[PDB]
Each structure stands twice: as structure tokens, then as C-alpha cells.
PDB file of C-alpha atoms in Angstrom:
ATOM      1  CA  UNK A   1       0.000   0.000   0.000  1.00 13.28           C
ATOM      2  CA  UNK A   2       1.061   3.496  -0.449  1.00 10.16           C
ATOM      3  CA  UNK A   3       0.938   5.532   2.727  1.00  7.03           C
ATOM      4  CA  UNK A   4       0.989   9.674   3.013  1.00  7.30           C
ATOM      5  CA  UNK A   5       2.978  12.047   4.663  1.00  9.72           C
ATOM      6  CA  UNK A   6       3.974  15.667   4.593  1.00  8.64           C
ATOM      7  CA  UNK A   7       2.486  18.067   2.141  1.00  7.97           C
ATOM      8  CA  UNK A   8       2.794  17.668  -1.337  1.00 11.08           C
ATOM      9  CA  UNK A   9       2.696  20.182  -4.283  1.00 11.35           C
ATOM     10  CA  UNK A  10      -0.151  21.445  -5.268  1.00 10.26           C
ATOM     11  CA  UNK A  11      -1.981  22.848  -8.469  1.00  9.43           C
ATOM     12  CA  UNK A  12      -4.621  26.125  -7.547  1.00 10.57           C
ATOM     13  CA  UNK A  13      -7.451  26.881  -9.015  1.00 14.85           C
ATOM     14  CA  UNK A  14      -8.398  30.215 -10.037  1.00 15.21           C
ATOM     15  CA  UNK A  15     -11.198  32.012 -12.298  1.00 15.29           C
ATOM     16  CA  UNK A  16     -10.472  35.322 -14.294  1.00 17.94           C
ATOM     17  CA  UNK A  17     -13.331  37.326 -15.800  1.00 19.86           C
ATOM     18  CA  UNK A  18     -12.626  40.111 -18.621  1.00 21.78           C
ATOM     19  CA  UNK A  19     -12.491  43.112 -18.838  1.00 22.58           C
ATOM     20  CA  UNK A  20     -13.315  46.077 -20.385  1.00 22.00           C
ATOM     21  CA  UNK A  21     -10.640  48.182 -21.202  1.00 17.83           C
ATOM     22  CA  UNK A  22      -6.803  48.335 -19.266  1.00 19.37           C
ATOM     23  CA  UNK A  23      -4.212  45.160 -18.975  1.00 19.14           C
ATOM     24  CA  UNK A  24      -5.948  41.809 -17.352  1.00 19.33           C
ATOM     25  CA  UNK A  25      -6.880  42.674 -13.745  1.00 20.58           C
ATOM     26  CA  UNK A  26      -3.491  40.544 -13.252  1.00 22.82           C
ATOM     27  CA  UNK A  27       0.276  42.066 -14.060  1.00 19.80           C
ATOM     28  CA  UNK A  28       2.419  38.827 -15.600  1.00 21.64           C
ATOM     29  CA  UNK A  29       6.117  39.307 -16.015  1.00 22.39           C
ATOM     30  CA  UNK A  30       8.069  37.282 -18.436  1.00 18.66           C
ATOM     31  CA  UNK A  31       7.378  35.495 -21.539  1.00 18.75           C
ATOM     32  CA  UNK A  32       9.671  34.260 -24.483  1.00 20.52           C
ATOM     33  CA  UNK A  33      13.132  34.852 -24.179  1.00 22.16           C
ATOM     34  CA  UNK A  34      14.625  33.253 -21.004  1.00 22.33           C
ATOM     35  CA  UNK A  35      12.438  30.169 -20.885  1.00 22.82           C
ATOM     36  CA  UNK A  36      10.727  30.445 -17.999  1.00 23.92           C
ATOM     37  CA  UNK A  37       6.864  31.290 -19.007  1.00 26.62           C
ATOM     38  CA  UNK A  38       3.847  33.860 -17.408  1.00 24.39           C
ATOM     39  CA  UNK A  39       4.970  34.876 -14.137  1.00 25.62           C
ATOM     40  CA  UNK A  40       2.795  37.429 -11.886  1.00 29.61           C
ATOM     41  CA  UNK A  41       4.001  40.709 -10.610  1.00 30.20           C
ATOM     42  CA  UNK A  42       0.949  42.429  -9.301  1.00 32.89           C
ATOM     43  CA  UNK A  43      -2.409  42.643  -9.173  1.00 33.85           C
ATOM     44  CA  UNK A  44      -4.927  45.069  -9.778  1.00 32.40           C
ATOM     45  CA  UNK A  45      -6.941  46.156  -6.876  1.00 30.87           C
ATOM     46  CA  UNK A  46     -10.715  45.662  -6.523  1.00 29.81           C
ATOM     47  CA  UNK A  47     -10.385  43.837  -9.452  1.00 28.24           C
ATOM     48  CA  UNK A  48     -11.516  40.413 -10.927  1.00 29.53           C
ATOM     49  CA  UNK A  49      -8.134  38.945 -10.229  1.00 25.71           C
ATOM     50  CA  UNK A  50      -7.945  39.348  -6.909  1.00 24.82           C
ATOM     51  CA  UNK A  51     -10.968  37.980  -6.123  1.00 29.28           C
ATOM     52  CA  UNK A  52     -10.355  35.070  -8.502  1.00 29.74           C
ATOM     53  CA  UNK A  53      -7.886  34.387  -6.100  1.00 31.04           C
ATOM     54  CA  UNK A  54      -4.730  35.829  -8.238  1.00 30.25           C
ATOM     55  CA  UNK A  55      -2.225  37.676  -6.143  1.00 29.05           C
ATOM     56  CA  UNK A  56       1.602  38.800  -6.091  1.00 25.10           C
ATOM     57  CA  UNK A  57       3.830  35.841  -5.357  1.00 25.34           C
ATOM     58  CA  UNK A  58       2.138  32.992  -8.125  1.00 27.02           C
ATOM     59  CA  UNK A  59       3.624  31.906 -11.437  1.00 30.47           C
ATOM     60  CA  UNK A  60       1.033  30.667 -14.353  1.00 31.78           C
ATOM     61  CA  UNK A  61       1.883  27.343 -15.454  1.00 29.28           C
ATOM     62  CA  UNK A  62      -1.079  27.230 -17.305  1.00 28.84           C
ATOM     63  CA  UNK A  63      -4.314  28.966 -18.271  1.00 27.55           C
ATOM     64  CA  UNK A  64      -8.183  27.769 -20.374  1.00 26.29           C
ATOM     65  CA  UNK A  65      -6.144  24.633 -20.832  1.00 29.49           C
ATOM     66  CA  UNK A  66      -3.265  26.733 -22.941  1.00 31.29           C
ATOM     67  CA  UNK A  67       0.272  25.561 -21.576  1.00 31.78           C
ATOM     68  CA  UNK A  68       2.255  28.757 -20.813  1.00 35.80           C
ATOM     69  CA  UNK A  69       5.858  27.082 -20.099  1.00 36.85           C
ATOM     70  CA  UNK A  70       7.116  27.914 -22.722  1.00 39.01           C
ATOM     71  CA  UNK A  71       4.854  30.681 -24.681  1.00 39.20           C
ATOM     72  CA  UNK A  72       5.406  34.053 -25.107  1.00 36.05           C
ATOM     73  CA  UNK A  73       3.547  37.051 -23.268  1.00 35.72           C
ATOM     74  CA  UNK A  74       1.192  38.513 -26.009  1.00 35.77           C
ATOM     75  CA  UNK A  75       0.009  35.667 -27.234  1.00 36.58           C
ATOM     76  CA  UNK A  76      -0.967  34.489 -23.268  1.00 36.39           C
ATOM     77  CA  UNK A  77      -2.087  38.312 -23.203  1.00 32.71           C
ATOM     78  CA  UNK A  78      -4.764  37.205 -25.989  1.00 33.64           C
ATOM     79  CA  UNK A  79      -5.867  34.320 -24.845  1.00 34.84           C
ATOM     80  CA  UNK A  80      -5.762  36.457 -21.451  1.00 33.08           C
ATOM     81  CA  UNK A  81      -7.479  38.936 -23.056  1.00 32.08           C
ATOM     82  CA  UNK A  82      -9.694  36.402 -25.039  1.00 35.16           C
ATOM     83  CA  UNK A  83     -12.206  34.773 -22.579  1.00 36.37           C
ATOM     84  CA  UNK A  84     -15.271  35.532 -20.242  1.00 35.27           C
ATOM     85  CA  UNK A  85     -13.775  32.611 -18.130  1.00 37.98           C
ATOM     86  CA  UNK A  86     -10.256  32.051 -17.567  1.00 40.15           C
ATOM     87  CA  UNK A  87      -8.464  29.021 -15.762  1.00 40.89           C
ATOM     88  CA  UNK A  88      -5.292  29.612 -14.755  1.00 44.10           C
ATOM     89  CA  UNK A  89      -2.996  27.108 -12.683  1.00 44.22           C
ATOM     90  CA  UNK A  90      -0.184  27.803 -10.684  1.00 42.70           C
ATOM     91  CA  UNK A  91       2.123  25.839  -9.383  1.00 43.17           C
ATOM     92  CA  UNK A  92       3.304  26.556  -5.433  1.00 41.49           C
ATOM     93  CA  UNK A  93       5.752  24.296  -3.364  1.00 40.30           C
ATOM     94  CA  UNK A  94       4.593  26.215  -0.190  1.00 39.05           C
ATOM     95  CA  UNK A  95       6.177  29.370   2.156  1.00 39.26           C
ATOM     96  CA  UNK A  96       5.402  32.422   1.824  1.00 38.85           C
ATOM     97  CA  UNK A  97       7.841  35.459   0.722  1.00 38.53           C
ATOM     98  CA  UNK A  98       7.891  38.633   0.858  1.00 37.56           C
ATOM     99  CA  UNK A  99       8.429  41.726  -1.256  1.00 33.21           C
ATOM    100  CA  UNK A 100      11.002  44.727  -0.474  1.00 31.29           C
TER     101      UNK A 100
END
């Protein structure tokens, strides 16, 4: 048998509505260049991202399916930009940083 122990990894879950006009209620850093995909930088306040359940401190793995690993920024920005209900996944290993 296989028996647990310790956390684990874990993939979150969060929902992204659109908008009308200005950049995704998210900020992503990164894209195609370095190899590293969508990361997040901030996070627009009172906005549809941070009630999703985006924040500062998250990377997007993934998003409506859409592997962002290895994609670059506008075309995520698109697809970002191109949806009334986004599914992002990121990937956390647990802690919690700090900015400064």
C-alpha cells in the first residue's frame, strides 16, 4: 500500500473574468526569451483577479487549458485577453515570501 505524509505540491485553481478596457486585472512578467513562461508581478486592486484568487507571489503554469511554459507574453495576453472565463494554474511548493 502506499501511505501519506507531509504536504505535497499542489496545483490552484483560479477564475479570471474580462475586462473592459486596461491590462488583465493581473500584471504577468516574463514570456519568451529566457524560458521560464507567465509569471505574476501584481495585481490590480478591486479587481476580478484578486478575487479570482490571483495575487503577487504565483507563477502561471497554465491557463483555459493553454500551456504557458514555454509561450510568449502577447500571445498568453490574448488568450488572457480572449475569454469571459479564464483558468489559470499555478504551481506553489509552499512558504510564503515577501516583497522589499
Amino acid at each position: 500500500g502506499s501511505s501519506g505524509s507531509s504536504g505535497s505540491d499542489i496545483i490552484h485553481s483560479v477564475r479570471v473574468e474580462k475586462s473592459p478596457a486596461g491590462r488583465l486585472g493581473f500584471s504577468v512578467r516574463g514570456g519568451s526569451e529566457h524560458g521560464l513562461g507567465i509569471f505574476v508581478s501584481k495585481v490590480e486592486e478591486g479587481s476580478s483577479a484578486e478575487r479570482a484568487g490571483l495575487c503577487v507571489g504565483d507563477k502561471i503554469t497554465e491557463v483555459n487549458g493553454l500551456s504557458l511554459e514555454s509561450t510568449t507574453m502577447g500571445s498568453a495576453v490574448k488568450v488572457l485577453t480572449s475569454s469571459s472565463r479564464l483558468h489559470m494554474m499555478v504551481r506553489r511548493m509552499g512558504s510564503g515570501p515577501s516583497s522589499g
